[PDB]
Write a protein that binds this ligand. Structure first.
Ligand SMILES: Nc1ncnc2c1ncn2[C@@H]1O[C@H](COP(=O)(O)OP(=O)(O)NP(=O)(O)O)[C@@H](O)[C@H]1O
Lengths: 553, 64
């Protein structure tokens, strides 16, 4: 008698109350119920991201079942929960005769299957005829992915099935559903939770957690945090618990800088960010303001919740532009990996893989996968218009919404991410800014120039576009002096113990000679090694000029 | 001084050229530890020849 075998009623557990109460879903349930109440297409299904609380509905279902919130028709029904596995004879049979049993068993339950919904090789009809019985109320679900592939092939799968959005919360209600935690979940590991330790884990895990899910990722760390607060306390008086400890500390697990996690969130960062940029690059006060000044606008919901942060930058690579976000990200997202590379040389058609794609090794792509990897990101576009009509059209969604369907068709939020265009479209007009135009005219000259390669939608959805214009030696030597700063702070700190000297030669050279007008100090950036680091280390590496000593050319 | 002679006599024989582009890192590996010399082949390449490594600001080459 195969009833209980992989089919384990949890309305048992629900009658047992083993199952876990939460809020609001009646909406999906009542429908999905009502779906289960349908002669025609019975089977409600959640299509999309895993781990979104599917059987948690089935819980609520089972709850509504055992609560007799289960409506009339199906009150007799309940749910055996399948356990999808067996030992090979082969598996199918065991998974089949049940199917007979249960409709024979007279609708005391329904079945839920979760993401595992099978395109079998030997497909034939697996459970399908049983499903096809004009009978056999069931509950399936899967991500969009399989939903893409398998269930669309028939589509009279739906004749049985019903898709429903995998229900992904709002943060506030995630916060709220995890706000119900504070009186209750303070004492799970035996403390209290402040308003401090309360909302942020979300706000954090939202902002700071790459992977898990809105109440999930949020509810995760606090108990992951309790290693200290639960165990070291009873190992001392802490009653209430605080954000940082519970979170930022235990958030600093991954990276660190809880102060930037905490002591400043976005507020001051912007407030001075102008010069903070100027810190990294003096000059281009325009974008020093603008993009910054802009991207300040980017947040705070002045405009669309769905909305990207988008710019083309103009100048001579080795102007600091390609860097620039890495400051900004390091300034904002506290990272340079947020910066992500889109090579418009690479772009013709076939790229639709390389982001991500519905995989037909043709497998998971990268670039969207990278934000899919890196939910907070900065997107760099390598001489944009050098790309083909290929990406720029998908760039619409990038132009859109700050959210991106992967090539398997899975959206990911860029409104929390950055997108930045590169082009030479003013190269000649850089040469015009070499003549140092009223920038308007030459930017107009550029604007028209850049106007050409793109439909305005491209042109319009950009948060803005800025030149990084002719760079006076002012910046250079500063930037150079900044350029100076980077190596020395790598080494005297730990490695080289190094005190320094500068002839004005190098001071002038590097600025004069090392900086190229057109190709920039960008090579000098490498040369700064060569004629200096390469040179003087080589001078010093003997040690006869001692440690901490210095000899400039 | 530290540089030496490389001279690419181009035999190109999927894109079979990007090899010629991939080597631009291999010299960048050496970090301008050589020089390149190309003789009578100077033309639109793929696409344009050379520069992105030179256009990186790097890469002493003997042009002809
Ligand atoms: N004005 C500048 N301010 C700051 N860094 C600069 C500047 N000009 C050049 N650099 C340096 O050059 C690089 C940044 O140049 P950038 O304008 O961002 O284009 P780039 O693409 O990064 N150069 P490259 O990536 O090799 O093509 C970094 O190594 C910077 O240190």
């Amino acid at each position: 008698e195969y009833l209980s075998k992989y089919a384990i009623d949890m309305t048992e557990q629900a009658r047992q109350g083993k199952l876990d109460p939460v809020i609001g879903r009646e909406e999906e349930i009542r429908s999905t119920i009502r779906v289960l109440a349908r002669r025609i297409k019975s089977n409600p299904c959640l299509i999309g991201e895993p781990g979104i609380g599917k059987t948690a509905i089935i819980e609520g279902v089972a709850q509504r079942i055992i609560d007799d919130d289960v409506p009339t028709i199906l009150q007799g029904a309940k749910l055996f929960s399948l356990d999808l596995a067996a030992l090979t004879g082969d598996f199918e049979e065991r998974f089949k005769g049940v199917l007979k049993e249960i409709e024979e068993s007279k609708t005391l339950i329904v079945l839920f299957i979760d993401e595992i919904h099978m395109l079998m090789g030997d497909a034939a009809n697996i459970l399908k005829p049983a499903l096809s019985r004009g009978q056999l109320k069931v509950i399936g679900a899967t991500t969009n992915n399989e939903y893409r592939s398998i269930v669309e092939k028939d589509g009279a799968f739906e004749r049985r099935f019903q898709k429903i959005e995998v229900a992904e919360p709002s943060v506030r209600q995630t916060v709220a559903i995890l706000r119900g935690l504070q009186p209750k979940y303070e004492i799970h590991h035996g403390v209290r939770i402040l308003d401090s330790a309360l909302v942020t884990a979300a706000q954090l895990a939202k902002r700071y957690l790459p992977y898990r899910r809105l109440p999930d990722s949020a509810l995760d760390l606090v108990d992951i945090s309790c290693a200290g607060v639960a165990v070291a306390r009873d190992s001392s008086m802490i009653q209430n618990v605080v954000d940082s400890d519970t979170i930022s500390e235990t958030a600093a697990r991954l990276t660190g800088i809880p102060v930037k996690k905490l002591s400043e969130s976005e507020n001051e960062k912007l407030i001075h960010m102008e010069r903070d940029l100027s810190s990294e690059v003096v000059g281009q006060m325009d974008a020093i303001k603008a993009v910054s000044n802009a991207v300040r606008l980017s947040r705070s919901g002045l405009a669309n919740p769905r909305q990207p942060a988008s710019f083309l930058f103009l100048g001579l690579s080795g102007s600091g532009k390609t860097e620039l976000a890495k400051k900004v990200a390091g300034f904002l997202f506290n990272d340079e990996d947020m910066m992500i590379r889109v090579d418009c040389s690479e772009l013709s058609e076939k790229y639709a893989v390389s982001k991500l794609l519905g995989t037909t090794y043709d497998e998971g792509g990268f670039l969207t996968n990278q934000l899919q990897y890196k939910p907070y990101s900065v997107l760099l576009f390598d001489e944009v218009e050098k790309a083909h009509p290929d990406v720029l059209t998908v760039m619409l969604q990038m132009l859109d919404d700050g959210r991106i369907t992967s090539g398997q068709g899975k959206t990911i939020d860029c409104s929390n991410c950055i997108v930045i265009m590169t082009s030479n479209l003013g190269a000649e007009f850089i040469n015009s800014q070499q003549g140092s135009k009223i920038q308007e005219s030459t930017k107009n000259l550029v604007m028209g120039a850049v106007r050409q390669h793109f439909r305005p939608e491209f042109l319009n959805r950009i948060s803005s576009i800025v030149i990084f214009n002719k760079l006076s030696r002012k910046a250079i030597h500063k930037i150079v002096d900044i350029r100076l700063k980077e190596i020395e702070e790598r080494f005297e700190q730990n490695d080289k113990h190094y005190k320094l000297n500068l002839t004005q030669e190098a001071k002038d050279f590097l600025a004069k000679y090392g900086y190229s007008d057109d190709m920039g100090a960008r090579p000098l950036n490498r040369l700064i090694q060569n004629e200096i680091l390469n040179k003087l280390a080589l001078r010093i590496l003997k040690n006869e000029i001692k440690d901490k000593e210095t000899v400039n050319v």
